[PDB]
Every structure is written in C-alpha cells, then in structure tokens.
C-alpha cells in the first residue's frame, strides 16, 4: 500500500 514496501 506504500511505495517503499512490497505489496
């Protein structure tokens, strides 16, 4: 849900 984590 955020650009800096894997979703």
């Amino acid at each position, epitope marked *: *849900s*955020h*650009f*800096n*984590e*894997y*979703e």
Partner: antibody
Framework: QVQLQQPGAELVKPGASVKLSCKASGFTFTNYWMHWVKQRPGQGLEWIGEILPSNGRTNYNEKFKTKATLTVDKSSNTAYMQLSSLTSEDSAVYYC???????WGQGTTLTVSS | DIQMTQTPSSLSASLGDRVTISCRASQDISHYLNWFQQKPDGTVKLLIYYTSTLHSGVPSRFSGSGSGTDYSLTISNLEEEDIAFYFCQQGGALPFTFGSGTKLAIKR
C-alpha cells in the same frame, strides 16, 4: 492473530515526556513498517513517521522531528514512540499501525494537563 | 509534501444509496491511494489500497478508482455498518499524508 495492542489512555503533565507502546501479536513484525499517527478532534489525521524493525530505519514527518522518537524492542515484538516536552497541543489520540497488509491499533488517548 | 484534498467533508445519504467520496492529490501519486474506515469506537480498518485493490474481507460493494491526481471511493448500496468516517492516505512519496475525511450519516 494480527493484533496491535495499545493502552487506552495516558495522563501526563506539561513539560514531561511519555513513551507510547504498541505490542504486536499474531505475526512477527520484522519486515513490516510500523507507523504512528496523531488524531485530534477537528484536525485532519497527521502522519508522524514509521520505523522498519529489521534494520531500524526511520522515516519522519519533519514537523514531528524534535517531538517524536520511534524505536522498537524486537525481543518483545513491540514498537514505541517517545514524545518529549509535552504541551496541551500534544493532547490527542495516537495510533500505531503496520504496513503492508495494513492493520491499526485501537489508539491511545493522551491527555496533557496539570 | 503531497497534500490531499478530500471532499465532501460530510455526507448524509439513505441506506441503499450509492455514495462517492473524492480525494485529489497535489501532484501525481502513482496509484498509491489507500482508503481507511474509522468507526465511532476508534477502530480503523484499511478498505482499499493501491487505488482499487480491496483488502481482506472487505465486501464487494466498496470500490476505488482514479489515477494521477484524482481518486474516488464508491459504496454501491450503503448499509448501516458503513456509517463511519472515511479518510484517504497517499503512499506515493514521503512524508505520507492524509485527506481531511468524510463523515457519513443517515438521512432522515
């Protein structure tokens, strides 16, 4: 069972400091970002920042840089946010949360009063 | 900072009605728009992430759409359990920021 446990309320004096806790359970928080958010009655929600427990990296909203300190205790799977130099402007409900696969704690109501 | 402008700030509708809430970002957020629902007891849940992906257990009456800077959350047929405070969050750039929220109410 994917729970974030926060205390319901804290009462502290102006000028004091407080350490809010956020105990995770039902998952190991190592690779989840742990965020903190401030909510006050007539204001929009504010993002304070986040910490990644695996390596301790933090990303802060610069408005809260001298006010909040995020840390984690990996051995108890707990995230913390220390607030310093409390004023009545710090009175608010503070939430912790994880991301990705977001899940939020129930919030701690902090009152700063004499 | 990417500032989020959410409208409307309050909305009264009839149960069974279709309701739509919007969030406009200041600059492109590359689809990272999340919608959160908060109940009167303080409980907060993620409903939709990355513009249109429903989170676990969220019913199919909830849908999200949008791109670039313009985003919407739509509830097809309002149910009583949907009466709550809704807010968006951009996760496209640091610092993360929220819309100011939409309080739903039942019209009578």
């Amino acid at each position: 069972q994917v729970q974030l446990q926060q205390p319901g309320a804290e009462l502290v004096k102006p000028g004091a400091s407080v350490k809010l806790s956020c105990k995770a359970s039902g998952f190991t928080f190592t690779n989840y970002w742990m965020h903190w958010v401030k909510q006050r009655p007539g204001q929009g929600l504010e993002w304070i920042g986040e910490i990644l427990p695996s390596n301790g990296r933090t990303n802060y909203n610069e408005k809260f840089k001298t006010k909040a300190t995020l840390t984690v205790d990996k051995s108890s799977n707990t995230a913390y946010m220390q607030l310093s130099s409390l004023t009545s402007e710090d009175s608010a409900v503070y939430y912790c949360a994880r991301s990705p696969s977001d899940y939020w704690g129930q919030g701690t109501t902090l009152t700063v009063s004499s | 900072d990417i500032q989020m402008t959410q409208t409307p700030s309050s909305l009264s509708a009839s149960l069974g009605d279709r309701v739509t809430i919007s969030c406009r970002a200041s600059q492109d957020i590359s689809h990272y728009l999340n919608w959160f629902q908060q109940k009167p007891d303080g409980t907060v849940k993620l409903l939709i992430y990355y513009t249109s992906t429903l989170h676990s257990g969220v019913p199919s009456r909830f849908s999200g759409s949008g791109s670039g800077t313009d985003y919407s959350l739509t509830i097809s047929n309002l149910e009583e359990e949907d009466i709550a405070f809704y807010f968006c969050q951009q996760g496209g750039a640091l610092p993360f920021t929220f819309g100011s929220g939409t309080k739903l109410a039942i019209k009578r």
